[PDB]
Design a protein around this ligand. Structure first.
Ligand SMILES: CC1=NC(=O)CC=C1
Length: 164
């Protein structure tokens, strides 16, 4: 069912995350972490304290898809287990902000072609697939985008609901 999902998304905030490559999404999926640039880190920290759920929706650039979405489970922190992000040549690990712990809500992909009817009011109502890294997606668009993903039957949102 979608009911616990809808509960987790109730009054969530949603942020488009752009990964340069699949390796970093796969590391995020395996490690339950994400790191972003300071400008997005501060937005996500602000959002994490402001909303019951902060949902990161991941898209690998040039993939034409979203690769799933995750709920922030912490603010960003530094010093932890280092993550060997395959970073775009031009960026160093120091350029990144701290590390967010995330709980994956959906590890399945969704092709952009399936979200072509969703516009993001916070990006001039451009298709929700369109957005810079860190782009916040308004609640209704964000919720409908997440409900478009194939259900991820490997995930039990029971523990996620407990965190919120
Ligand atoms: C982990 C990562 N985050 C980004 O915001 C860009 C590239 C790699």
């Amino acid at each position: 069912g979608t009911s616990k999902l809808k509960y987790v998304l109730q009054d969530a905030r949603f942020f488009l995350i752009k990964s340069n490559n699949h390796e970093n999404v796969s590391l995020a999926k395996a490690k339950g972490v994400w790191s972003t640039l300071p400008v997005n880190e501060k937005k996500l920290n602000l959002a994490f304290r402001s909303a019951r759920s902060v949902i990161l929706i991941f898209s690998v650039r040039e993939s034409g898809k979203f690769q799933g979405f995750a709920r922030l489970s912490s603010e960003s922190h530094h010093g932890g287990s280092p993550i060997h992000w395959v970073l775009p040549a031009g960026m160093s690990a120091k350029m990144l902000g701290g590390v967010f712990k995330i709980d994956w809500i959906c590890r399945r992909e969704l092709p952009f072609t399936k979200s072509a009817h969703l516009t993001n009011p916070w990006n001039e109502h451009k298709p929700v697939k369109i957005g810079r890294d860190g782009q916040e997606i308004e609640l209704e668009c964000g919720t409908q985008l997440c409900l478009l993903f194939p259900p991820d039957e490997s995930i039990d949102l029971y523990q996620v609901i407990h965190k919120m």
